[PDB]
A paper describes a structure:
The ability of the knobs to twist and rotate with respect to the body of the Fab likely enhances the ability of bovine Fabs to access recessed epitopes. There is no convincing electron density to indicate tyrosine sulfation modifications in any of the antibody [name] regions; however, BLI experiments indicate that Bess7, with 3 tyrosines in [name], contains one or more sulfated tyrosines. Low sulfate occupancy or flexibility in the [name] knob region may explain the lack of electron density for these groups.
BnAbs from cow-485 were named Bess, while bnAbs from cow-488 were named ElsE and assigned numbers based on their order of discovery.
Numbering used by the authors:
A (entry chain H): 1 to 82, 82A, 82B, 82C, 83 to 114, 119 to 262
B (entry chain L): 2 to 9, 11 to 27, 27A, 27B, 28 to 95, 95A, 95B, 96 to 106, ...
Write the structure that this text describes.
Amino acid sequence: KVQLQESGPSLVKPSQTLSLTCTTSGFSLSDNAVGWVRQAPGKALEWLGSIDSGGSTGYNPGLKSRLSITKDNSKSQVSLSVSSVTTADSATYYCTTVHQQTRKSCPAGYTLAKDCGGSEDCYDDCSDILSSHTLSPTTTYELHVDAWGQGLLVTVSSASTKGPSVFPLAPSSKSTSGGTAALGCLVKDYFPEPVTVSWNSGALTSGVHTFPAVLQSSGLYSLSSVVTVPSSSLGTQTYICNVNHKPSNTKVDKKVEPKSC
Amino acid sequence: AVLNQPSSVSGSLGQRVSITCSGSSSNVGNGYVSWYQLIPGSAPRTLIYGDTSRASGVPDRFSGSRSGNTATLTISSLQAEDEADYFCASAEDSSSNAVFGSGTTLTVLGQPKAAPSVTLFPPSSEELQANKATLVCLISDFYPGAVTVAWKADSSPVKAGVETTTPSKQSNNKYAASSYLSLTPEQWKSHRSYSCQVTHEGSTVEKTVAPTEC
């Protein structure tokens, strides 16, 4: 039941501050570390930073000057701010739970000073403490992401948001494959990404495929979603495509009705 | 800062593939490497942590190992669903500082070939009443995922106004693609027919629509 929900703006102008929030459930926020990871389009995963159970934060060294991470245990929320954003900061941003642990081990004979009542150094003879052989402990760092959030796509652009226009792709005799028929919806001219599509409020999942968007020369995106249904059901069963465009807080339901031919 | 992974690795169905992850003494060599699987259109999934420990729900055909500054993710009994991007990671000089690999795309060869099924939608009545016209050509259920799409007006090629998406995987491990032809409603009613022509593995499927036809 460990769930992580990123929230924040989908579009931000250059030089502005990107502020994201992560709402958590299924685990105690005050006893687990939460981290932010991002992935720019076509690039590799990039660590941003984390905050642990004690409230202490660690950041990516190359980006530390632009990053701020805070949390509120009583609200089950963790925040992330990125200052002076540019096009290079366009990415999917992930909230995560992270295992974090530093181990300091000493060889045989040498004892860690934190054990024997340079607290993080080894000592051969704790009785000497002054004439004792001392070394540096073998330090290993453990970090892995446990759970991943669904991610929030953030586009850095000076262009303006635009809600989508949804048009039916109605089946006909030129759209059937015998017992099955294809129908869909064309989601045209929206900005920015992403758009998700479901069918009959999610009650229809088999045969569904939502195609990746295409970038027109106008700067707007378009995509299509298709579903295969029995051809005999076109007269009776009604089919509705549910379009979700969070950047503009738009939801569109479009009934796809069959053509006469 | 960025661990070194091969850009792409290939294997056949049922066979074995190893993905390498090379770093330095301050990350991979420090000895606690993790592995993550990214399927297109899905959140990342943790597969391996602590070099060899397997996360719950991960099949035992995923296995991790490490030798010095190089870690390896081995995938055996290779299945079509394994096609994804794979990233390694480890801490670097702090348990709150992570570095990731450059990523590896896994392709699973030896899957059943399939010719594409093409569906061409004419501009809808609603879009026409908005003084716009888009022809939508949907291509589905083909393998391998490499098609070429061409458009015709009556019988001459059409180059302008065409946008085509790169083929991506469906839920049944077959590939799908889409292509669009944007026209004015006048151009739509001008010619006698429009065609979407898809070439795939020495096969060509062409669908035609006509403004005079329903």
